[PDB]
Paper text:
Gram-negative bacteria use type III secretion systems (T3SSs) as protein transport devices for injecting virulence effector proteins into eukaryotic cells during infection. T3SSs consist of a ‘needle complex’ composed of a basal body commencing in the bacterial cytoplasm and spanning both prokaryotic membranes, into which a hollow extracellular needle is embedded that serves as secretion channel. The tip complex (TC; Mueller et al., 2005; 2008) tops the distal end of the needle. In Shigella, it is composed of two proteins, each essential to host cell sensing: IpaD and IpaB.
As wild-type TCs can exist as either homo- or heteropentamers and in order to obtain a map of the functionally relevant heteromeric tip, we used the TC map from the ΔipaB strain to remove images that contained IpaD homopentameric tips from the wild-type data set. Therefore, the one from the data set showing the lower cross-correlation should comprise primarily heteropentameric TCs. This map resolved to 24 Å resolution and also displayed a pentameric tip structure and clear helical pattern in the needle portion (left). However, the highest subunit within the wild-type map is morphologically distinct from the others and from the equivalent one in the ΔipaB map (left, thin arrows). As we have shown that IpaB (62 kDa) is found within wild-type TCs and requires IpaD (37 kDa) to localise there, we assumed that this larger subunit corresponded to IpaB. We therefore docked the cryoEM map of the needle with the lowest MxiH at the needle tip, from protofilament P1, lying right below this subunit. After subtraction of the needle density, four IpaD subunits can be docked into positions β to ε of the TC, showing that the volume occupied by the subunit in position α is larger (thin arrows). We then docked into this portion five copies of a crystal structure of IpaD that lacks its first 38 and last 10 amino acids, from which amino acids up to 125 were further removed (i.e. an IpaD fragment containing aa 126 to 322). Finally residues 323–332 were hand-built into an α-helix at the extreme C-terminus, as this region is strongly predicted to participate in IpaD's coiled coil and was not resolved in the crystal structure. However, the subunits are much further apart in the new model, allowing for the presence of both a cavity and a perpetual pore within the TC.
Author numbering: 125 to 332
Write the structure that this text describes.
């Protein structure tokens, strides 16, 4: 907030401030947001398929026929595709201590701390998908099961629940990203006044 250093150092620190945010805030969140988005976008593709996976067989209530295997197969391909996909860092490693930090800063439910090797990373939490598969596994024989209305709805409730858990974390990401912009903005705002005070402060010193 003053060091009575050249305007050269001030304009330099300012420029540096933009680089910091861009890499630690924007990029950091543009990845987590993109990563999660891509995944949920793959899950939404499953939902579209889910519609053609349900049919009647009452007779009738209407008892619902569900292609358990078909849904299980799709669901286990999604978790696979994003099983180890990381949210942070985008393309590097970190200390399990700093990895646990980031996770506790954007919630904790959204991602899961893990180690690849060379360090640690905060990967996507595949719990929602797991609970989904556990629910389907509990359904019964494969790869086609028929459940009365009460049973179907009860299941759909659980299923739908999981969906929203991801739908939520998805929106949250957008938050943690906008927050990064805030902190970065707060930075440049005071950094600027700093440079100027140095300038006016500097001028008095120059003036002295």
């Amino acid at each position: 907030g003053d060091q009575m250093i050249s305007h050269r150092e001030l304009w330099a620190k300012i420029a540096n401030s933009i680089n910091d945010i861009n890499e630690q805030y924007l990029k950091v969140y543009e990845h987590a947001v993109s990563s999660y988005t891509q995944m949920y976008q793959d899950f939404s593709a499953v939902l579209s398929s889910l519609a053609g996976w349900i049919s009647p067989g009452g007779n009738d209530g209407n008892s619902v026929k569900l292609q358990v295997n078909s849904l299980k197969k799709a669901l286990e391909e999604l978790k696979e595709k994003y099983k180890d996909k990381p949210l942070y860092p985008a393309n590097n490693t970190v200390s399990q201590e700093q990895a646990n930090k980031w996770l506790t800063e954007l919630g904790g439910t959204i991602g899961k701390v893990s180690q690849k090797n060379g360090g640690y990373v905060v990967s996507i939490n595949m719990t929602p998908i797991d609970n989904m598969l556990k629910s389907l596994d509990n359904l019964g024989g494969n790869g086609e099961v028929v459940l009365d209305n009460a049973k179907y709805q009860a299941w759909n409730a659980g299923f739908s629940a999981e969906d929203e858990t991801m739908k939520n974390n998805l929106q949250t990401l957008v938050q943690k990203y906008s927050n990064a912009n805030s902190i970065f903005d707060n930075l440049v705002k005071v950094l600027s006044s700093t440079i100027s005070s140095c300038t006016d402060t500097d001028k008095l010193f120059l003036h002295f």
